[PDB]
Each structure stands twice: as structure tokens, then as C-alpha cells.
């Protein structure tokens, strides 16, 4: 058995910043464990994790993919001839570059271990025996071969969350995005079950890429998709889904999904409507990995969804393990589980305690057209706060009068402490909202205040200047109000 | 002689703004002078001023279009099959839709007077007769029939700049960006004589809408186009200009131009090199327009160049008179003439001295690919501050890869002020750049340091993650580079 100052078990967006940093900063032994090396079926992440693999860096590729269709209709507004009855999507080519794409950044992976000095990968099931030993075995099956038995001081898990199935008949004829991003032929119908941003980002790849005449169905169990999210910019997103042509069932969830003879799903809704697909994704949500674990053999203990319950640190409650990322289960994006896994490096190793903010921590939804959104919801400030302020507006941009998608309304909307100007939260709908949020990110942890936006300049013409373009008030909560 | 609070010469982007403020906010009797209500020949700039008829917004629509040349080409990477031989510009669709939307915005502007009691617009060209009497001329001729003689308390300079010319033979066969707005047929060979913002976003407009086998050829004076910006994104911007086939010449000048029995010009340099083209466009400068005011008649001091001396609060040595804008000569953006209308108004109607800050104010450059800039370059930092770090960081988007465009680099250079690192210019050169510097400026504004850039976690994946991604400078000033 060999001796390691840590192991992780996860290479992926966490565990690979935390060994990394471990390894080489701080001349440490390190083993890594992750499942494969090279993307794909059969455990679809591996060396680098779900957002390399199965998750941020393939979805932005085919979601760039799915917006070149809107971008060949509306060229003919700004006088671009072209013989559009001839233009065809081709699936096929899309995953064969996509697929190219994520190869090399595994290679580069493999690279990375060959240049450094403490850093050894191990490709194999990790499971605890006791805390202070960890076996890589030949599968998830407690009883499949092991491989090698690691003597350890630390242990960090990292392994990450996978997707939650719905306990229905016919659960096995629906996929989830693990599938998707391998599927053989673009589907005609399809079905992507769930109101969350995975479920509606799909649901725009499967629109661009069907075959004409073919439909794309969201469903939803709730009134309106993307909990979460600020409500009037989910109402705004859901017609504009619409107009590009998706069907969003609200109130609708799967009932009975039954193979039909030639290969389609015939499913039957909650309600008693049916209809049949090419296929039925399910992306309902993820839940924390930690069943295979063995984590009670090692007494860290977990929550009812799987959570690796841990402190402000990520220590469990063993101390010498701590688990960071997706398992975690407190904001499920890469940059958190990357700053994760720094904080964990110099609280352990450089013996500095940085517990990780996850506060006013921003985020953007890939849909056609996208969100960009960081801080409060106004139910959520108005909760809180005394005086809270909801500054709006919408636009057309110039440019949709031209070309033809006259339904893309540029909506920004921002939540203001009424006492203080403090603002609590900015939430964007529109093209480039993504890229604009990131620095109002910067201005949120930083404590601007809504004078601070209006009295910069502005850069014109740009749609991101309507944010030092608001001074009134829509309307306030006093504890309530609308 | 009749009697108003404030005549406005100039209905542009800061007059407009500061006549609507003292009409309706604080109930004046304004009146806004302008040669034309509607866009187009003789006067080209009307009622809106330069922006709004030929600038940002017709710019703005043009290089949006132009922008389709590369996307339908970058289709292709992510299975976007069509007829590649049936694509072809119409360059009449494009300024026929520009001219639409620029007679809606024209339309809108009368609607404006007409919905407010004490703003009334006067047709001529206003020339000052006495500190409170300006009158409103048949042309720009000194003994020209005087149409309207207004008499008032305050007058606000606010006419703007011109093109400026080259004094070569055949200066007469070259056009300006204004001509370049209204021109019939997109040239199959064109000439951008400059090397500021202008011609470059002309270039690409010119290189995208031309017939095949055509050529557009930047030429410049200097050594290296887009004087006053950053050294490396210049170097950048050049080599992906280039890569677009467009052909920059540096030291290359103009020495006579002659028109060609064909219709086409023929352009002889100065270094005895020739080549003809249908069009040459000179966008060497703009030059405030002060010119056939009569200001020496107010006794009112021009400052050589044409631009009126003004103090911070946009007052000139006679007290009632004011000016704004291009024709000041200090930043020649529509924000900040507009801010200062606004700031204006507030000091001499509303009686609280403001001040427009003209520092730390962003812009940007809708080249193909664009950029977006705020503040200092290193050259001019180095020189203030003691030690200076620059930061920066150059990647292709993986896109880039999947599509053909390989040479499309993204880069970020920060400068800072390495005592406390305070964020004192950030460059960016790629696509978004524009609507990510927009935001930036908030922060500078409100003097970040660079820390509380690498402190904000990043929305992934986006390009903008890359200003929350730089901790380590590339290299310092220490008065000299270190
Ligand atoms: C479709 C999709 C789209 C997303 N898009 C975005 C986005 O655009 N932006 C964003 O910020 N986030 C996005 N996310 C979320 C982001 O992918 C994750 O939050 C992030 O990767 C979590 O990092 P992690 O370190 O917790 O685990 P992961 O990156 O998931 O890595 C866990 C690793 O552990 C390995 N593993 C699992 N169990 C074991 C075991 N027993 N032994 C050994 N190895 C094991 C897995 O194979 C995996 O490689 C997306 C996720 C999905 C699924
Ligand atoms: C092609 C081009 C692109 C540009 N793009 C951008 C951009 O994208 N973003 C940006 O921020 N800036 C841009 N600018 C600069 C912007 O157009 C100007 O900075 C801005 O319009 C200046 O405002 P102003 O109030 O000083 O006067 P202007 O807006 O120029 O208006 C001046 C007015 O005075 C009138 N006038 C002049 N002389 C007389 C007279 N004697 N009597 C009566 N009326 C008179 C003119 O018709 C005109 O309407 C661009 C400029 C050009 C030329």
C-alpha cells in the first residue's frame, strides 16, 4: 500500500483545482482517482469532470450550434441572399466536432500529470474502507476487484452529482443529458421533461437541430419554468421560447412512457393527454453521488438527498475528510466548486482557513435568447429588507425591428435596498447578458449602490448601457406591494 | 430679437438633451436651431444630430449586417449545410432598412417637440449677431437672407465636428463617412484613407458587402493604426484585419487622385505606388465646428483647431454662453456630450454647479472583431505612477476552433497601479468586448483594485470570466518596463 499526504476521489472541476494546487504549490503526494480517462460512455465524466466531459464546455459548443439557425433567418433583414430552402442542419458533424473539442482538452489533462512532481492519477471506483483508506476497485459493486488500497492523512470527496430518473413506468425508455450529448440522429419530436436550465438549454439545441416539421415539447410540473429565477423575466423567456417555436406544457409531467414498434415513445401525460417522441430526456435535477461511497464505513455522515453534510471549510464531521463541490450540494456551478477546492488547499496545507462565499455568486442560462442573473429575487430582498426598490426596463433592440425577431425584448430588471441604494440583485434577459453580468458581478461584491450605475457613463450604442440608464423606481415592497 | 431663456445652436446628442432638461424639468423658453429635421444630403447630420443620422446608430445597424459575412461562413464548423455559391450581399436592402429606421428615429424627435409647451425648433444656420442674440440664416454665408432673430438670456454652442479633408488634387473625387451612408453600390474596391475608429469600422462594413474578387485597402501614415489605444491590441487588431483579407498600409499616403474614364479613381501614393478603386474614403479626423459662428463677434475665444475653450462647467470667458460637445474638442462620444447637456442644465437652471468627469470614461471600437476600452494605456500610467504591473491574457474561445476562425483571439490587458492595485485601464479585443467594458466602467468609477476582480467567483463559460482570471502581472513599470 502506498502512503499520500491526500487523496481525492473526483477529477473533476473541484477535485482537479485542490490536487493541482496541493501537488505542485505545496509539493505534497497526491492521488487523484477518477473513473476513464477519455470522455464518453460508458460513465460518460471522467478526467476533468462533468463540465469538460458532459457538461458546460460541450453544452456552450451545441448551443452556439443551435443559434447560427436564428442568425441564417435574420441575416435576410440586413440584406444577405442566400438559398435558405437548401439549408440543412447536420447533427452528426456537430457532435463529431464537439467530440473533438472535448478529446483534447482530456490529452491536455494526461499532460498535466506527466509535468508534475507529486500528482498520480488512479483510474478505477474509489470506496472507503475506514478513514484513513481508500481502495480503487474495478467497478461500483462492493464486491468487483480491488485494484489498489491507499493510505492516506486526508481525504477529499469530489465526486460530483448525477441525474435524478423519474420512479415511473417506462423510465427506462427516457434518457438524460449524459445521452443527449452522444445521441446518434437529431430527434424529430422530442421531449425534455423539467423547468430548470438544463431542460430548457436542450430544449433550444433539439429545436435548431430537428428536422422540419418535427417539435420540441418542455414540460414542466410547475406554473411557470426555472425556479429560482426573477418571475418576470421567467414569463418574458417562456413567450419568447414560444415564438422561436418550442411547445412549453406547463402543469404537465410524465405519467407512463410505453416503446412503440418503430423505436418512438408513446407517453401519457398526468393529465390523460399522450403523445409520442423520438425521444424523452429526462433532466429533472441532479442529486449529490455519494450512494457508492461506503462513507459510513468511514462514519461521515450525509443528508436524505445524499449531501455530504460539511462546515463553512468543507470539513465533515470526520475531520480529516472534507468534501467539496456538486456533493456538497450548496451552489452547483464549476467556478464554486473550483473556489471550493482553493479555500480547502489553504485551510488544510497552507494552514490559512478561507471558507468560500457563495453568496452574490452570478450565473447564466445558455437558452435562446440567455439570462445573465446574480443576487436576490425581490420576494427574497423583500423578505429581508424593509425598503426594497424594483428598478425595470425593456427594449427592443433596433437591430430585431430588422431583422424580424421583433419578440426579443431586452428586459433588465434590478433590486435595490430603498434605504441604502445598496443594489441586491440584477437579472438580465437577452443576447450578451451572460458576458454583462460577470463584471455587475464584480460591482455587487464590491457593495455598489444604484447612483454608482446611474452615473457612469455610458458606452453607445450597446445594450449593456441600460443599466446606468435607470434612476426611478418601478415600484417598492414594503414587506409587500407590486 | 424675441425672448427666450436659452437658444441652442446645435439640436445634436448634448443640445437636444440640455433643451428638453430646461423645458420640461425647469419650464424654459428654449429654442433648438438645426439645418434639417430628417437625415440625408445637403446637411447629412439633422434634427438628433451626427449619432442618431450618420454615426452611432446607422454605424451601429451597418456593422451588425457586415457581421453575417463571418457567422454564415463560421456555420459551417457546426453542421450548418447550405448552398455556399448562392450567398450573396445586397448592400441596397441594408442602407434601404438603415434608412427606415433612421427616418422612425427622425419622426420621433418631431413627436418630442410637439408634446412640450416651451421647446420650439428653428431651420437655419444660427450665427451669433451679440452675447444675446443669435440669428437663424438663410446658409452659411455671413450676408445671407437672416430668417429669425432670437433674443436670449443664455446661449449653448453645441454644433459638433466635421470630416476633415486632405488638400491633394481630386480631394473633390473622395468621400467622407457622410457620402459612405447614402452610397448606391457597395464598392467592388475601396480605399479607407485613416487610422482612427472610423475607417476601421468602415473598412469591415466595405469588406463584407463587396462582390467577390473585391479588395478594401485600409492605408495610414503612420507605423501602426488606432493611435492612442493599447500598442498590443493594436498589433492584434491589424493581424485579424488582415486575416479577413482586408489590406492595411502603413506608411502609405495619398498623393493624388484622378478619375478614371471608367468612373473609377485612381489613387497615386506617396511612395509612387498606384491602384485604382471606386471609392476613397477619408476618415482622417473631425474637426470642431465653429467655424462660421461668428464668434469673435461675442468676443468668444476658439482655440486654433476650431474648438471652443470652455471651462469644467462647459462655460467659456463670456459667462452666459456655454458649449458642449464635439465642437469643445474633449471627449467625442454622444454619452458624453449628452452628460454634459444634462450637467449643463443643472448648473445654470437648476442652480447646482455639476461638472461632466471625463476620465475613467469607456468606448468602443465596432471593428469586426471589436473592441471595448476604459482608461489608461501602460504608457501613460508608467509616467504618473511609480511601479505600474500590466496584466493580460490572450485565448481563442474553443468556438473558434469548431469554426474556421482560428485567428480570432480574445485578449484582456489590465493596467494597474502596483502601490495598492488600483485598476487603472482595462483593453479588451474581442466579440462582446463592447457590452463587457460597459460594466467594467462601473467598477473603475468606483476605484476597484485588482483584487476585487480576482475576488468576484466567474460565470463559466464565458469570455468575460477571463477579468476574474488574472492575479499575476506579465511585467511592470518601474518608470522603464520590468
Ligand atoms: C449538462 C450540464 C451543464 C452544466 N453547465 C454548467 C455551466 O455552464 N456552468 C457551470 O458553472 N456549471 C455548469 N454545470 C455544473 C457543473 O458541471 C458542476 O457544478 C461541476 O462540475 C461540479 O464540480 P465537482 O468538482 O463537484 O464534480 P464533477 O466536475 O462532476 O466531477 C466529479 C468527478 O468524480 C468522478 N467520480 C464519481 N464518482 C466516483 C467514484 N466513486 N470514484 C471515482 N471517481 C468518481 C466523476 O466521474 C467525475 O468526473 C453543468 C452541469 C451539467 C450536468
Ligand atoms: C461615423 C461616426 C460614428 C460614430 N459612432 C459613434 C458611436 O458608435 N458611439 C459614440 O459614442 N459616438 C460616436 N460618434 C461620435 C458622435 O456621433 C458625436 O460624438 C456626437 O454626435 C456629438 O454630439 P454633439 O452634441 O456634440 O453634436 P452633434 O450630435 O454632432 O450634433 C451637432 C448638430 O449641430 C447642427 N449644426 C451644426 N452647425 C450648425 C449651425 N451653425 N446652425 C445650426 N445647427 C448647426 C448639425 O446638423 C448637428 O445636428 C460617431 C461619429 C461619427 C461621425
Chains 1, 2 share one sequence.
Not at 490529452?107 to 470506496?127: I, K, N, P, V, W
Request: net charge negative; aromatic share 8%; hydrophobic share 40%.
Amino acid at each position: 500500500s502506498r502512503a499520500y499526504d491526500l487523496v481525492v476521489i473526483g477529477a473533476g472541476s473541484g477535485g482537479l483545482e485542490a490536487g493541482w494546487n496541493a501537488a505542485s504549490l505545496h509539493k505534497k503526494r497526491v492521488a487523484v482517482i477518477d473513473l476513464q480517462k477519455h470522455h464518453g460512455p460508458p460513465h460518460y465524466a471522467a478526467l476533468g469532470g462533468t463540465c469538460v466531459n458532459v457538461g458546460c464546455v460541450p453544452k456552450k459548443l451545441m448551443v452556439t450550434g443551435a443559434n447560427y439557425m436564428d442568425t441564417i433567418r435574420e441575416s435576410a433583414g440586413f440584406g444577405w441572399e442566400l438559398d435558405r430552402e437548401s439549408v440543412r442542419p447536420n447533427w452528426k458533424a456537430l457532435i463529431a466536432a464537439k467530440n473533438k473539442a472535448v478529446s483534447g482538452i482530456n490529452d491536455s489533462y494526461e499532460g498535466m500529470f506527466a509535468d508534475t512532481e507529486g500528482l498520480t492519477f488512479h483510474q478505477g471506483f474509489g470506496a472507503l474502507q475506514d478513514n484513513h483508506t481508500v481502495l480503487v476497485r474495478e467497478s461500483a459493486d462492493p464486491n468487483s476487484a480491488v485494484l489498489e488500497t491507499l493510505d492516506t492523512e486526508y481525504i477529499l470527496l469530489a465526486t460530483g452529482s448525477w441525474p435524478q430518473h423519474l420512479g415511473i413506468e417506462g423510465d427506462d425508455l427516457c434518457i438524460t443529458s449524459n445521452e443527449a450529448f452522444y445521441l446518434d440522429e437529431a430527434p424529430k419530436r422530442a421531449l425534455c421533461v423539467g423547468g430548470g436550465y438544463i431542460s430548457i438549454e436542450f430544449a433550444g439545441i433539439f429545436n435548431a437541430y430537428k428536422a422540419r416539421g418535427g417539435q420540441v415539447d418542455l414540460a414542466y410540473r410547475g406554473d411557470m419554468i426555472l425556479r429560482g429565477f426573477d418571475s418576470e423575466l421567467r414569463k418574458q423567456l417562456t413567450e419568447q421560447l414560444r415564438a422561436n417555436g418550442i411547445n412549453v406544457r406547463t402543469h404537465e409531467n410524465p405519467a407512463k412512457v410505453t416503446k412503440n414498434a418503430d423505436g418512438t415513445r408513446h407517453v401519457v401525460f398526468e393529465s390523460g393527454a399522450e403523445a409520442d417522441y423520438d425521444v424523452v430526456m429526462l433532466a429533472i435535477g441532479r442529486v449529490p453521488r455519494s450512494q457508492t461511497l461506503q462513507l459510513e464505513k468511514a462514519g461521515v455522515e450525509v443528508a436524505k438527498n445524499g449531501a455530504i453534510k460539511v462546515d463553512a471549510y468543507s470539513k465533515t464531521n470526520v475531520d480529516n475528510i472534507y468534501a467539496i463541490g456538486d456533493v456538497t450540494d450548496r451552489v452547483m456551478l464549476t467556478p464554486v466548486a473550483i473556489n471550493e477546492g482553493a479555500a480547502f488547499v489553504d485551510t488544510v496545507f497552507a494552514n490559512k482557513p478561507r471558507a468560500t462565499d457563495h453568496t452574490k455568486v452570478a450565473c447564466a442560462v445558455f437558452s435562446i435568447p440567455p439570462m445573465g442573473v446574480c443576487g436576490y429575487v425581490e420576494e427574497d430582498a423583500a423578505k429581508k429588507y424593509d425598503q426594497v426598490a424594483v428598478y425595470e426596463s425593456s427594449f427592443t433592440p433596433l437591430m430585431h425591428n430588422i431583422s424580424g425577431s421583433t419578440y426579443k425584448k431586452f428586459m433588465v430588471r434590478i433590486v435595490t435596498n430603498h434605504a441604502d441604494g445598496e443594489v441586491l440583485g440584477v437579472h438580465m434577459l437577452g443576447d450578451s447578458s451572460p458576458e454583462i453580468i460577470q463584471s455587475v458581478a464584480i460591482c455587487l461584491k464590491m457593495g455598489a449602490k444604484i447612483s454608482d450605475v446611474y452615473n457612469t457613463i455610458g458606452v453607445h450604442p450597446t445594450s449593456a448601457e441600460e443599466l446606468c440608464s435607470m434612476r426611478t423606481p418601478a415600484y417598492f415592497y414594503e414587506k409587500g406591494k407590486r
